[model samples]
Target chain A: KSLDHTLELKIPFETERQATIATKVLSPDPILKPQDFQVDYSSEKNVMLVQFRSIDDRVLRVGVSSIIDSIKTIVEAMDVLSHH
Target chain B: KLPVAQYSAPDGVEKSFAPLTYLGQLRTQLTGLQDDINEFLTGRMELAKNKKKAGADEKRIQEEINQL
Candidate 1:
């Protein structure tokens, strides 16, 4: 297997603060920990691109999906706070 | 900061959706594309397993192409 790859997921944050929060959340306790995934945050675009390589593709997908889900939850929570 | 690309099509492009509707359609399309790519990767992985060889390279290349 090639065991080398990249995955990009673009998510828009409603505000700069939200984007900062997301960056903080995703920076530590890296997804697929111990493998050292590469996560880059683009504040201008409010997008996070996570790239990683592993022999287990399934685990990678699940891990990325989980990270995305967590980010989405955080975004939603931020929205709720703003509304309240 | 970049100029938007204009679609050079016929005069009547059948535009009928509101801004939210257009955004919704775009979101749906993006989600569908992601799922399609995932399915393609899973199938390729299975094929590689059956063949007893690593399928990583082919799948990785396809993924890169899809991103482009």
Candidate 2:
């Protein structure tokens, strides 16, 4: 209900299957001060999305990047691991 | 410290899987993001993308989404 900032990002995948696989992979680990930080993903209207929120802008910036790094991870992995 | 599922082979972790290569690192990074969004995200997947300020990242994801 109060914050210096907030963020919501929609990262896209090649397909719902790809997006689905990435979601299945990302959503299990825990974080510290969850009250201060949060992340989410979803599929509706056929688009992939990832959401994030933090206590402040500095945290929001760094956290967005850290999570972006994670997203880069997803794309690259599928680029290699699908074995297609 | 990392969970048993994830860790760097700094020294004692010397094995085929001890060190996470650039590619391996990529694999798990996706896995990590995926887990947070799908597994733990309490929010719902909306059919819209929000518009925000200094939205460089936003433009990029949109481009990335288009590419995907």
Candidate 3:
């Protein structure tokens, strides 16, 4: 029971520099299972956007949540640890 | 535009809910992060105020003695 799933996530930062930093930091990582999943990363203004594609539910959930976790940490550190 | 959720499911059936599930999770995480960030900033500001007040009383006493 395999089907294609797609989801886009938009995360807004306090500044364009922050969003750009996140995009660059995240975009370079490669997909572990290219046959079943992939992600595209970009930023617009102060928002970072990620487009996800997966072959099925399990793949989608795993990949999406993993990225979400990373994003949470990245954003938290950006705000809490950085002065600029 | 808002986040997109699209699925290619079997005919005549509901689409997969995976995307929506992640969407909900993302929102929740962001909300929690906002609360944490707010708390951290508030604490940092309080610390700054405390530091600024560290030698304030001594300075005031010194100034009063010098004026007398």
Candidate 4:
């Protein structure tokens, strides 16, 4: 009721190991504004969820896109660390 | 003018987008990182799948070596 647009994205992976690692990798820092953006995920399950709500669609899209970029980075690191 | 990780849009970005403010242009560039991010995710899935296969192999090797 408060927002013009809202989005939720939940991505699945094959293992909880990577899920936990990815969450921990991306969770330590504050990436953006607290007013309009928020993120959450489960460490024990192979699922990560992202939620966004804003009066501006552009803001939500940009924030979500940037977070996906962060997730992408964690996945890359997980792959490298898992290998060696 | 200092060495720190950040992003800045070019001078003609406003002309390209036409009416987008500096913040808006920044969002444009930020949103556009999705493609590269998607690439990284795809690469991760591929490598992790391989690692899983290797992990299975390792499990077998460990079991064969020691019953514990």
lDDT of 1 at A29: 54
Q: Model 4, A1-84: lDDT tens per residue?
A: 234344444545556666676676775344556565554545547665555554443444456566666766665555556555
Provide a comma-separated list of chain B TM-scores, one per candidate: 0.46, 0.30, 0.47, 0.38
What is the interface RMSD, in angstroms, for predicted model 2? 12.6
Model 2 chain A: ten consecutive residues of lowest lDDT: A1-10
Name the 10 consecutive residues with the lowest summed lDDT in model 4 chain B. B1-10
Query: Is model 2 an incorrect, acceptable, medium or high docking prediction?
Result: incorrect
Q: Candidate 2 versus the native: TM-score?
A: 0.47
Chain B TM-score of candidate number 2: 0.30
Count of clashes in candidate 2: 13
Per-residue CA lDDT of model 1 for B1-68, tens digit only, reads: 11011111122222111113322343444455445445645765586588865567887999999999
Candidate 1, A4-79: lDDT as tens digits: 4445455555556666666777653554655534445445444443444444556545555455556556555665
Tell me the TM-score that candidate 2 gets on chain A alone: 0.75
Output the worst ten-in-a-row residue range by lDDT, candidate 1 chain B: B1-10
What is the DockQ for all candidates, taken in turn? 0.05, 0.05, 0.08, 0.03
Residues B23-63 of candidate 4 have per-residue lDDT tens digits of 23333443454544344335544664767646777988889
Chain A superposition TM-score per model: 0.65, 0.75, 0.84, 0.73
lDDT values, one for every candidate: 0.48, 0.49, 0.61, 0.48
Cα distance off (Å), candidate 1, residue B33: 7.1
